């Protein structure tokens, strides 16, 4: 088992620390955003170097998150079949992701927060890029 947390303080009192209890296949193991620390060098060996790498990926998380914000705010156009504005089917996170590759951006659909769009027109969708960084993406649904 690997006790480590990363990128935030999640659901309990802790820090960017190894303060992690044995849960096994839980929020520890199906969350590929927190360290799986091997405690054979994570006492003092992997302490400072991985700490500085944490700040490196932390600052480049701000960096690339801001860059993808610039990409987002420099509009997703998803065309759909609508009956005078009300659609036949529905615009969910996967369509929004796939259409965001028209901007060259590969984003996970799990960062796109919200419920299914059933209408023509504009929608501002919240994008959880990181624990403390959320972007606004404009999504435009047009009749085809």
């Amino acid at each position: 088992m690997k006790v480590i947390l990363k990128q935030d303080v999640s659901n309990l009192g802790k820090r960017f620390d190894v303060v992690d209890v044995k849960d096994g296949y839980a929020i520890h193991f199906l969350f590929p955003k927190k360290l799986a620390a091997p405690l054979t060098k994570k006492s003092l060996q992997d302490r400072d170097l991985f700490l500085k790498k944490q700040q490196e990926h932390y600052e480049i998380n701000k960096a690339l998150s801001h860059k993808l914000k610039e990409v987002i705010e420099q509009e997703l156009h998803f065309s759909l079949k609508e009956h005078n504005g009300r659609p036949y089917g529905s615009i969910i996170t996967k369509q929004i992701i796939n259409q965001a590759h028209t901007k060259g951006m590969a984003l996970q659909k799990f960062m796109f927060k919200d419920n299914v769009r059933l209408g023509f027109g504009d929608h501002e969708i919240t994008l959880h890029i990181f624990e403390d960084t959320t972007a606004v993406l404009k999504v435009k649904v047009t009749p085809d």
Binding site: M1, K2, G24, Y25, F29, A36, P38
Partner: protein, 63 residues
């Protein structure tokens, strides 16, 4: 085949020695679970893997 794919550990054949020691041939099947895995080329795959190797995969961080 009801054996796993990482290793080839198959069923074990033994006796159902009940009370009064009547023998009856019986099979033991490995615990097979559909947990995923990630290879070092992408190609995430779903493989029927036994639980004993699932633990090894879990500690070597092969997911």
């Amino acid at each position: 085949a009801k054996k796993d794919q990482l290793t080839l550990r198959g069923p074990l054949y033994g006796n159902n020695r009940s009370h009064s020691k009547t023998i009856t041939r019986r099979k033991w099947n490995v615990n097979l679970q559909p947990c995923k895995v990630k290879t070092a080329d992408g190609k995430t795959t779903r493989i029927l893997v036994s639980t004993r190797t699932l633990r090894t995969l879990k500690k070597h961080n092969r997911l």
